[PDB]
């Protein structure tokens, strides 16, 4: 039930919790999912890459 992450695509809140849209390595946009922060504790690298792209377009 664990899969390799290619990159983080976007973020959103829903019902007061943060979710991140995940592009899964070896898959296409047809397989993207929204995942809670809890599931991404091993993804600190790609999350800070994402948050840096947000900060720069601002």
């Amino acid at each position: 039930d664990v899969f390799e992450v290619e990159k983080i695509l976007d973020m959103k809140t829903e019902g007061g919790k943060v979710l991140y849209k995940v592009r899964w390595k070896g898959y296409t946009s047809d397989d993207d999912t929204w995942e809670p922060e809890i599931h991404l504790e091993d993804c600190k690298e790609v999350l800070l890459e994402f948050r840096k792209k947000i900060a720069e377009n601002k």
Binding site: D1, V2, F3, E4, V5, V22, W24, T33, E35, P36, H39, L40, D42, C43
Partner: peptide, 5 residues
């Protein structure tokens, strides 16, 4: 690596 739900 992440869990997929």
């Amino acid at each position: 690596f992440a869990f997929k739900s």
